[PDB]
Design a protein around this motif. Sequence first.
Motif, mmCIF file in Angstrom:
data_model
loop_
_atom_site.group_PDB
_atom_site.id
_atom_site.type_symbol
_atom_site.label_atom_id
_atom_site.label_comp_id
_atom_site.label_asym_id
_atom_site.label_seq_id
_atom_site.Cartn_x
_atom_site.Cartn_y
_atom_site.Cartn_z
ATOM 1 N N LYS A 100 0.846 -1.186 0.000
ATOM 2 C CA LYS A 100 0.000 0.000 0.000
ATOM 3 C C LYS A 100 0.882 1.237 0.000
ATOM 4 O O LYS A 100 1.802 1.347 0.817
ATOM 5 N N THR A 101 0.601 2.165 -0.911
ATOM 6 C CA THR A 101 1.410 3.366 -1.022
ATOM 7 C C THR A 101 1.195 4.265 0.195
ATOM 8 O O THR A 101 0.257 4.091 0.978
ATOM 9 N N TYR A 102 2.091 5.242 0.349
ATOM 10 C CA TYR A 102 2.018 6.154 1.485
ATOM 11 C C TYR A 102 0.768 7.022 1.467
ATOM 12 O O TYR A 102 0.425 7.602 2.502
ATOM 13 N N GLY A 103 0.085 7.126 0.325
ATOM 14 C CA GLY A 103 -1.160 7.868 0.277
ATOM 15 C C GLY A 103 -2.313 7.179 0.975
ATOM 16 O O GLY A 103 -3.323 7.827 1.269
ATOM 17 N N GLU A 104 -2.186 5.881 1.249
ATOM 18 C CA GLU A 104 -3.236 5.128 1.919
ATOM 19 C C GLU A 104 -2.973 4.908 3.402
ATOM 20 O O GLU A 104 -3.930 4.717 4.160
ATOM 21 N N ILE A 105 -1.714 4.931 3.835
ATOM 22 C CA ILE A 105 -1.389 4.744 5.245
ATOM 23 C C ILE A 105 -1.712 6.029 5.995
ATOM 24 O O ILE A 105 -1.917 7.083 5.384
ATOM 25 N N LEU A 106 -1.758 5.951 7.322
ATOM 26 C CA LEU A 106 -2.112 7.083 8.174
ATOM 27 C C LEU A 106 -1.036 7.312 9.226
ATOM 28 O O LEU A 106 -1.308 7.437 10.422
ATOM 29 N N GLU A 107 0.220 7.348 8.785
ATOM 30 C CA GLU A 107 1.313 7.697 9.682
ATOM 31 C C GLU A 107 1.120 9.113 10.208
ATOM 32 O O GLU A 107 0.821 10.037 9.446
ATOM 33 N N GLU A 108 1.290 9.283 11.517
ATOM 34 C CA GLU A 108 1.049 10.560 12.175
ATOM 35 C C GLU A 108 2.375 11.274 12.413
ATOM 36 O O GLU A 108 3.264 10.739 13.085
ATOM 37 N N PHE A 109 2.501 12.476 11.856
ATOM 38 C CA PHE A 109 3.718 13.258 12.015
ATOM 39 C C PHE A 109 3.832 13.788 13.438
ATOM 40 O O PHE A 109 2.841 14.191 14.053
ATOM 41 N N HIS A 110 5.057 13.786 13.958
ATOM 42 C CA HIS A 110 5.317 14.252 15.310
ATOM 43 C C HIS A 110 5.980 15.616 15.259
ATOM 44 O O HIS A 110 7.104 15.726 14.744
#
Lengths: 64, 485, 173, 60, 459, 99, 19, 57, 120, 94, 63
Positions: I107-117
């Motif tokens: 899954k590309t990074y457009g689909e993941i929900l990594e939260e910026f710190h």
Amino acid sequence: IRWTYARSANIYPNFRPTPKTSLLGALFGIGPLFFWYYVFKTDRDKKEKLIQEGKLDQTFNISY
Amino acid sequence: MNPFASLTLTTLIILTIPIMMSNSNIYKTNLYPNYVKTTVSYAFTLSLVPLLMFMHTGQEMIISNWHWMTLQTVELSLSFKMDYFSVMFIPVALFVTWSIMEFSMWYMHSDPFINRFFKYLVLFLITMMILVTANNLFQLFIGWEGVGIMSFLLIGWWHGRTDANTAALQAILYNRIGDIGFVLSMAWFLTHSNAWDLQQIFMLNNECPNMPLIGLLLAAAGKSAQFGLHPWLPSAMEGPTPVSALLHSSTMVVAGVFLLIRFYPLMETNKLVQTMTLCLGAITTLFTALCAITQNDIKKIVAFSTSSQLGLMMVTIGINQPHLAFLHICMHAFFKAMLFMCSGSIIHSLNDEQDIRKMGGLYKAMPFTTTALIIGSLALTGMPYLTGFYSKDLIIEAVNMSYTNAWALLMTLIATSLTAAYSTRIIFFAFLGKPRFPPLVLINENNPLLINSIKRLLIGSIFAGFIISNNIPPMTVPNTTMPLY
Amino acid sequence: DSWDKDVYPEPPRRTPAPAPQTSLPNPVTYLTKIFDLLVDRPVTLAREFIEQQHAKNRYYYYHREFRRVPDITECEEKDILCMFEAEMQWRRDYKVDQEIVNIIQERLKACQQREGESYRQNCAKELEQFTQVSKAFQDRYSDLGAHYSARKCLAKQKQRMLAERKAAKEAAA
Amino acid sequence: KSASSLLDLIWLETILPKTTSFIQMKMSIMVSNQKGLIKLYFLSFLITIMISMTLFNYHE
Amino acid sequence: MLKIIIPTTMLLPMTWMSKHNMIWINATVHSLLISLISLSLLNQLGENSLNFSLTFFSDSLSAPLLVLTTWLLPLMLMASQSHLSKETTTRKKLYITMLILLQLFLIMTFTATELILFYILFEATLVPTLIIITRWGNQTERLNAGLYFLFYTLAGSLPLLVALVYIQNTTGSLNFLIIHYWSHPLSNSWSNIFMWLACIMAFMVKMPLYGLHLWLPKAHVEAPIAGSMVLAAVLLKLGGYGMMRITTILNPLTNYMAYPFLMLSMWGMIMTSSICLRQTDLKSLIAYSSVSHMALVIVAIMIQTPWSFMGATALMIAHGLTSSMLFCLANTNYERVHSRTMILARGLQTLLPLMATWWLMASLTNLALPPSINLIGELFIITASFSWSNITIILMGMNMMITALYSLYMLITTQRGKYTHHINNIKASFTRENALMALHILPLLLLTLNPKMILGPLY
Amino acid sequence: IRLQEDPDPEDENLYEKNPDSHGYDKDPIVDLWNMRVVFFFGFSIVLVLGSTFVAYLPDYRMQEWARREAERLVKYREANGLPLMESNCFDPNKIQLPE
Amino acid sequence: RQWQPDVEWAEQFGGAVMY
Amino acid sequence: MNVLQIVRDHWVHILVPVGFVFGCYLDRRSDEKLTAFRNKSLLFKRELRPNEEVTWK
Amino acid sequence: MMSGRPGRVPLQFLPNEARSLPPPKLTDPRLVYMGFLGYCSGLIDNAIRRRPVVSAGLHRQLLYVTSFVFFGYYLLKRQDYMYALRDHDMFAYVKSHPEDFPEKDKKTYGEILEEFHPVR
Amino acid sequence: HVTKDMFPGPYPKTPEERAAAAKKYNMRVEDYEPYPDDGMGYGDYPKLPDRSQQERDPWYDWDHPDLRLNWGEPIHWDLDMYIRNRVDTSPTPV
Amino acid sequence: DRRFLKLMRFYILLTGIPVAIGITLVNVFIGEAELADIPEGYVPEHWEYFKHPISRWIARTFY
């Protein structure tokens, strides 16, 4: 060189852990330490709960 | 236009030349005195031409040539800020430095490092003038630190003297405490305004420069003697008479209030710091003047006169008059240096001594210095039509007029009274008429070059008080009517 | 000229055309023409030499052109090739943003002195174009630690999109 | 009396270097000062046999 | 990067076989030439790190340190001329071998592409430094000096070994580029803070912070004059490179975990500055000022700010230059006086006119005054720390308040005043010294004129 | 006597036995040669031609390139009024909104 | 010259066990 | 001029240069083992001209 | 990663099926270092017997560098052999056990929900 | 060159120890007294009264004229404290 | 000391005027570059994308 030795190396062999020594050594070994730590974390959390909703301004401070 | 773009910086280049000529080591160390004296003289002449160009076209300028960094949003360029402030301040600065260089040539005639001394004043005045025209705060701090450290070395010129190096340490200590506020100010600017150019910050119109103004006030209290950070000047005139009369009289002790003048658009936004500056400029005019009321040393009394009068332009920027304080520093360079010139003259003539005790009734044998000292004393006590009239006289009627702190208001007339007091103290002590000195009479200003330099500053202290006051464009508050009392 | 008014603006020039009210000769004009005669002309002719010898042998350079590449949004996770390519592209766009805000910095800085005491009213639009270049910059690049990455930049953009969608849905309840 | 001597030349050198070196001091002479009697060595084998056997119960 | 490493490695037989008195000449000349080859590496393409092979890569973070080390090797090389003119030829070649192996291991560390190789060569530096300190030392306490240095560095390093092998097992690789590109958020798990501590404490050990700063004062004092500058100059900065690279995986846990050490630096950089007003030895004086500067660079790292990173990157180079600069002077005065007491000889300007001039700009660079790169490196840290936590400027202002009080104090109590009447063997300064501080101070302003190169890899 | 030692030797200075020396070695001719080599590349081309090398290095991070290529972008986007910057660098449309 | 271990410095080990 | 003796006592200054060029050649060697994406760069797909045959060596 | 491998003949340095692997090149960087490893043994030998270290009995040096480079060469074939086998039954086990290695979806990074710190 | 008597050592607790330390610092036993036993490594070092060097006689032929010190004399643990350049114990008018 | 300062300057300018006259000469023989658009057909070599001639030469040899 008597004064040089007695100011550099003679300290520890003649040093005894007196109650006064331990007391004030701990005093300024954790007083300024934890006090600066406290004031710094205080202001850091101050801005932390001033920025999550947007009170603090970041208009021209781009070059952080 | 284009000549104003070129010559305004050739004025600096021509003085950079003798310094690297010194680094060439081919220069003859005995010719170098006259070399650098001549160079500062020409640089003064070549500094008038931007002055009358500006007087013709009333225009300011900032030059930003090849840059140093380009970090993200910061492009630190060689941003010289030669506006009306800088181009009007410098010609008087190089005139004073040239006159005192001739004075030092006469005075320092028996020192192996005479050329070293003179080039030292040269480098000091280079960083002074680049500080005068420095749009970016980085060049502002370059000049700040350069003049501070080179002051420190100039006080420590007599490195053998323990008191000299000790006083240099005190001076650098207090100047550096002020530099702490300077650091706070530049940190605030690089965080908020994220740029160094003064014009950029004034452009942003940050009407709440609380921390900036606090930092600049602290830096001024450092480099401009003010209570708490005042005593470094009582330490500073321990150095030679030329440095005591050039640096520690009207060139770098004025740097703090001058910096506040350059930062006036931010200053006028807040009025609390104006009241604090009123308080500081009053309290220095208190402490220094009352200490000079009874001081047994001619250098000391005039030094406290300096510090008090610097606090007077501090009061002037605290009553929202930056340009009045600017005219004040402009004619200050003339007159206060002039009286310190008289002080150095009597010192050299009167057995290299400075105390108000053991004088030889000098007026009989010290006539030229007597007249110069009397008119300088009248000038620092607001002599009408003289430098004093368009000076402390103006500032006093302004503070009486403008809405000012009461205690500051009464304090500044007490300060004027004390200014009369010690100025006449040197009068009735040195030239009193009762000889007290070694049996061999050495009180004599027979050196032609000493006379030339003293009269060169003397004509300015007579003329230049008004040869600039009405010529300038109308820039201050023109309060014409007011209560007679 | 090499530059242009569209990205390096400059107000039209205007001069008072000095007409002295006194019969004394105008000095500034005289010293300016003198400085022209003994300074401007020799450097001008030296640069004439330089220009002709330049035109004698001329060489060219070209804009080093790039092309668009798959970005992190389209980059597959664990796909190190497109990962690195998108990192390169995003970092050069970050440099582009820094440069353009530098141009706006210099525009507003020069405008301040160019427009005078009137700077507060003519550079305001310039100030208007600054108060929006900073904020949007903070939206596209800000607070990205010191190891700022196209992945971390995408994470910050994720914060922004979730925040704006949250505000939109809380407006709609 | 606070920066030098007491802190640097008294305290920090005492805590990490000197205290650990003193621990190694006190536990090197209680470890390597056996006389050399086969008996006490063999009873050291002895109680180890049961500690391995039943007390810990290695096999369990 | 074979271009610069291979000449250094193969330079070794040259020194180990050349004639008994041309070894100095040949080692010096070839050091200047491989430094010449080194400065060609200042180039950095865009934001890409300058890759060379599967095992060797460099970037704008690395290049200043690489060319630094290559520039220094001649410096202690011809500084050793005085102190090793009387010892055996084979021992002379062995000493040069130690220096060359040290420089080789440094340029191997800084160009490392994968973590564990960086670690192997990271601990490979102790062996030459330990040998140099212990064998060619002067006084008695040098043995305890070697003990303290070696044991401190190891006790720091081993947790980093365990942590790195754990990273390799878990993530899948230890290459710098991939772990930066395949970085993942280090959560707040109770194993994660020990992960962070293992990955950080090792570098912190050879970056003397408050409390854990005894090895440097008790080793640099009696380290050989050539060695001392090498310790004070580079191996405190390979740890800085270690932080620079390892902090890419330690986020976001670094946000709040750094606080204990963070403040331990700021108050620390005051205490080691507060201690710095009162030293009986000039070498200890320089060592404590160095400790203050590294506390500054530590707080520069731990904020994780591009401006903080720039201030750091400038600060390692500036501090190393100035620290070795002062240590050369300390060596010269000690060698003339055969002692290292502070106030033994004041007023040396009355005897060595140019030497105290060298002292003057050495202290001035220690002051961090503008426009020197010392000031700009400090200034970027000032701005970053202000944007971090507002008040930090108070403590850091105390640091830019103490620095000159001890730096110019050292001038007034060494060069200014008057000579002490008992000493009479102080001859005129030999051209070796003043030449070496010339090659030390002039490029310090040369690269100041071009700060982009050492400014940082985030440019 | 407690031990059979050679006493501490006097620390000879090169100038005393050999004036015009350089603090470089005992034999004067290699003293000279060391002078020439150190005052060579040390202060020579490494110090100076090296200064031109670092000063005249090719484009640094393409900043000289990034300068020129961004006024064109500025002009393009002011032609249609869309400003020199944007709120987002990565494009919202190509990336999906979770839930 | 530098310092080399005195007779006492070698003596401190001596004594079978040196600690 | 006893060239044999000069090379006997002065030949060390020659080994370091031949090392440097060696490194250079070795770097060149490294390049040929690492040509996986030969004109497969996704911003540098510039077409291979009929004259030359390689993008870089 | 092995001694219980089927068909593993004991006390056998280089098995027959190893020859299918590329033999190490005579200019292998590892091989040439272990040739250099021969030099260190030779140079030390003269030092132990306080013989002229640089040029004492080149005959001793020759066997010291030739024997070491030889036994290095055979070791490298075995080194590559085991690494080949470890990677050989690697894929055989993976292919023969598809269930234990599920095809993880990309899954590309457009689909993941990594939260910026925010790192401030 | 060197012996043990003029190396600073143990804290004196007996009159013989006081005499030994008095020789150790070349200053007599009767006016010899070390700093308190409160574990600052004071040892045998005498608590020299906290005066400066500005209070001494500048006209005296001090063998160290820069700080009015003399060739081989006991000096205070904080001599650099009370130098002419740094803090002075010279009396103030009142 | 004076022998030092003399040799310092002597060797600094020894190779100083050479490179200085060289850079001034190239600045007054071929100077800087002028912007050109698309190179139809011809692909620019890695040193063509620069502006200063000596910066082109340095990229020409070691780059």
